[PDB]
DNA sequence: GGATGTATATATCTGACACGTGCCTGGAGACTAGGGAGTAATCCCCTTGGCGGTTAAAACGCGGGGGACAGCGCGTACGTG
């Protein structure tokens, strides 16, 4: 609900070296649509979306 | 032998203090009423965290030219006696 807690769990999964991508309201759509179609993909790497 | 600087004693000024006195204004005691504290209900406004979309305002870069500022002359108006 928070994307400040958001930004806490991209921070941990930062240092933790995790593939995420991310997604909410200050991501503009273009970016949102290359994230979605980033994770859609079949050869995607990222394994959490937040 | 005459004239001069310092030292203790007495009279006078001068603000402060002890005493006197009035009186009036503040304090002690009692009573009362009402102003304010407390409670409950209802409803509207504000808080913190988010989202989406428009769009006009804010930010940034760059040319240039108008204006701030420094320097110099002068003559007159103000300082000074």
Same mark, same amino acid.
């Given at each position: @609900?928070?994307?400040?807690?958001?930004?806490?769990?991209?921070?941990?999964?930062?240092?933790?070296?995790?593939?995420? @991508?991310?997604?909410?309201?200050?991501?503009?759509?273009? @970016?949102?649509?290359?994230?979605?179609?980033?994770?859609?993909?079949?050869?995607?790497?990222?394994?959490?979306?937040?």
């Amino acid at each position: @609900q928070m994307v400040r807690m958001l930004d806490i769990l991209g921070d941990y999964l930062s240092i933790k070296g995790i593939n995420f @991508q991310r997604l909410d309201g200050t991501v503009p759509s273009a @970016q949102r649509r290359i994230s979605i179609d980033h994770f859609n993909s079949p050869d995607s790497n990222d394994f959490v979306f937040l």
